[PDB]
Amino acid sequence: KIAFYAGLKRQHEGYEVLKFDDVVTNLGNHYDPTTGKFTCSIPGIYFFTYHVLMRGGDGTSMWADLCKNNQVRASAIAQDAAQNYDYASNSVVLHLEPGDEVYIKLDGGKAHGGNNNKYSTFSGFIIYAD
Amino acid sequence: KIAFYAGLKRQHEGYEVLKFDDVVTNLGNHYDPTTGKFTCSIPGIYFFTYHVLMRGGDGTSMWADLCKNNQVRASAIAQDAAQNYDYASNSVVLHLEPGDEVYIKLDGGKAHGGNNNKYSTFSGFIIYAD
Amino acid sequence: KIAFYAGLKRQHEGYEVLKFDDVVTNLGNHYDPTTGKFTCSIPGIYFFTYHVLMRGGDGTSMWADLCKNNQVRASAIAQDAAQNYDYASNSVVLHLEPGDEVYIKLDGGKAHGGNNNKYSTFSGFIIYAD
């Protein structure tokens, strides 16, 4: 059984892997909140989704991408000229091999820190094992 | 088999549980459109997602949260200074016990009523049974 | 095994079926990038999700709907008065019969063409077979 769901506790900005450290579900423990990465243990087909809230009142654009190892597999942008809150979100279905790492990377801009409120999230589960 | 998908027929505002009463799928009947709550029957791991459209042309901010019993498990905001349409959306993976209730709550602001168009939605399914 | 995930390579506008032609996953091959349609082969319960990015700097509103055959099953809008990027996204759980087609239709406005960046996406998988 492999499934996880975590939220973002602190605010972040720039270009870095987002560490979702407010962990709600983590079956099998293959999501690591100290690195922000999900690591595949079983070859198969996996679903992931993310929702990253842009910081309000400071900046107009924010990008957040889902990566597999060193390769972008989904991109998203949040943008508002009045510096309002908005989301960068996307969802994927991916085949993974053991050792593959999946994570969300900020690609510019400012993300909201939601302490325990879980405004910004990352989740996933296996659909099929090879 | 446990899965459901429902849309919002009428407009709502303030602080209340959203009743998605345009029911498309409801296997096992454990989503109740008269209360807006999904009730767990089987201990296990469940996926949920929601997409709530803010009312356009009247107001600038709207909050919508997913709750488990009396506890928020995901939060979302829609915000636009020009009072444009925008979404409060999020997704979760949760462990539930029999009797647990999962639902979407408005936490301020105005939600769009989509009659039969299904602009605003709530869905879920079991991933694992304990 | 039935699952797929594809992104939008080119920009599109108006009223047309969106052809997600940047195919990442397509188990069983029942998603067709030349038509943009997923075709059911097995009666059962299916999950779908989509995220369509509105074109920035040209236009204020865009609509994107998920359809089953000739019937809308989910709707979404992106709107920004300053012509900023924003998303039309939704998710569904549907019962399908063999031959049923599921696809995303633009219902007005301009969608972003993300070449290989996968800003705009469509994915799905079977949850239950009848």
Side-chain angles (χ1 to χ4, degrees), chain A residues 1-115 117-130, chain B residues 1-115 117-130, chain C residues 1-115 117-130:
Chain A
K1 288 172 177 181
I2 300 161
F4 73 96
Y5 165 50
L8 207 61
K9 292 174 75 114
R10 298 173 33 249
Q11 67 179 40
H12 302 282
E13 62 191 7
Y15 306 78
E16 60 174 27
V17 175
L18 290 173
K19 280 186 285 271
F20 300 83
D21 41 2
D22 186 3
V23 186
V24 171
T25 304
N26 198 4
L27 306 188
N29 307 125
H30 318 159
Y31 176 74
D32 187 349
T34 70
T35 67
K37 302 174 163 173
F38 172 89
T39 300
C40 177
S41 63
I42 302 301
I45 302 287
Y46 293 76
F47 175 78
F48 302 92
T49 189
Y50 65 100
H51 297 263
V52 181
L53 178 62
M54 183 176 57
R55 198 176 305 165
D58 196 13
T60 61
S61 300
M62 185 204 64
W63 293 261
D65 305 332
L66 182 148
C67 300
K68 180 188 162 186
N69 300 326
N70 310 296
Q71 178 186 39
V72 171
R73 307 320 279 140
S75 307
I77 187 181
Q79 184 176 77
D80 193 278
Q83 306 187 78
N84 295 134
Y85 289 101
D86 206 345
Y87 276 86
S89 305
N90 220 321
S91 306
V92 301
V93 179
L94 304 178
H95 182 272
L96 302 180
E97 295 286 343
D100 283 347
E101 298 166 10
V102 172
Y103 56 91
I104 311 301
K105 189 195 187 61
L106 214 51
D107 196 37
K110 298 174 186 169
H112 177 75
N115 40 292
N117 284 260
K118 300 151 185 75
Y119 280 102
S120 295
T121 66
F122 181 29
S123 64
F125 48 88
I126 192 169
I127 304 164
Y128 294 120
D130 294 353
Chain B
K1 288 172 177 181
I2 300 161
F4 73 96
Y5 165 50
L8 207 61
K9 292 174 75 114
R10 298 173 33 249
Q11 67 179 40
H12 302 282
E13 62 191 7
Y15 306 78
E16 60 174 27
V17 175
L18 290 173
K19 280 186 285 271
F20 300 83
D21 41 2
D22 186 3
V23 186
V24 171
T25 304
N26 198 4
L27 306 188
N29 307 125
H30 318 159
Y31 176 74
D32 187 349
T34 70
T35 67
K37 302 174 163 173
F38 172 89
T39 300
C40 177
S41 63
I42 302 301
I45 302 287
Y46 293 76
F47 175 78
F48 302 92
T49 189
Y50 65 100
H51 297 263
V52 181
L53 178 62
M54 183 176 57
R55 198 176 305 165
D58 196 13
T60 61
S61 300
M62 185 204 64
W63 293 261
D65 305 332
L66 182 148
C67 300
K68 180 188 162 186
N69 300 326
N70 310 296
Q71 178 186 39
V72 171
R73 307 320 279 140
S75 307
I77 187 181
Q79 184 176 77
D80 193 278
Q83 306 187 78
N84 295 134
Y85 289 101
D86 206 345
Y87 276 86
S89 305
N90 220 321
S91 306
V92 301
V93 179
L94 304 178
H95 182 272
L96 302 180
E97 295 286 343
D100 283 347
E101 298 166 10
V102 172
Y103 56 91
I104 311 301
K105 189 195 187 61
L106 214 51
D107 196 37
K110 298 174 186 169
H112 177 75
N115 40 292
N117 284 260
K118 300 151 185 75
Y119 280 102
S120 295
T121 66
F122 181 29
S123 64
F125 48 88
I126 192 169
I127 304 164
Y128 294 120
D130 294 353
Chain C
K1 288 172 177 181
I2 300 161
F4 73 96
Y5 165 50
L8 207 61
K9 292 174 75 114
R10 298 173 33 249
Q11 67 179 40
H12 302 282
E13 62 191 7
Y15 306 78
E16 60 174 27
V17 175
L18 290 173
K19 280 186 285 271
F20 300 83
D21 41 2
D22 186 3
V23 186
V24 171
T25 304
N26 198 4
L27 306 188
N29 307 125
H30 318 159
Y31 176 74
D32 187 349
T34 70
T35 67
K37 302 174 163 173
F38 172 89
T39 300
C40 177
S41 63
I42 302 301
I45 302 287
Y46 293 76
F47 175 78
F48 302 92
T49 189
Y50 65 100
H51 297 263
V52 181
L53 178 62
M54 183 176 57
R55 198 176 305 165
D58 196 13
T60 61
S61 300
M62 185 204 64
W63 293 261
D65 305 332
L66 182 148
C67 300
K68 180 188 162 186
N69 300 326
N70 310 296
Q71 178 186 39
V72 171
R73 307 320 279 140
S75 307
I77 187 181
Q79 184 176 77
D80 193 278
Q83 306 187 78
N84 295 134
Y85 289 101
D86 206 345
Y87 276 86
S89 305
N90 220 321
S91 306
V92 301
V93 179
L94 304 178
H95 182 272
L96 302 180
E97 295 286 343
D100 283 347
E101 298 166 10
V102 172
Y103 56 91
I104 311 301
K105 189 195 187 61
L106 214 51
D107 196 37
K110 298 174 186 169
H112 177 75
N115 40 292
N117 284 260
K118 300 151 185 75
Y119 280 102
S120 295
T121 66
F122 181 29
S123 64
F125 48 88
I126 192 169
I127 304 164
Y128 294 120
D130 294 353

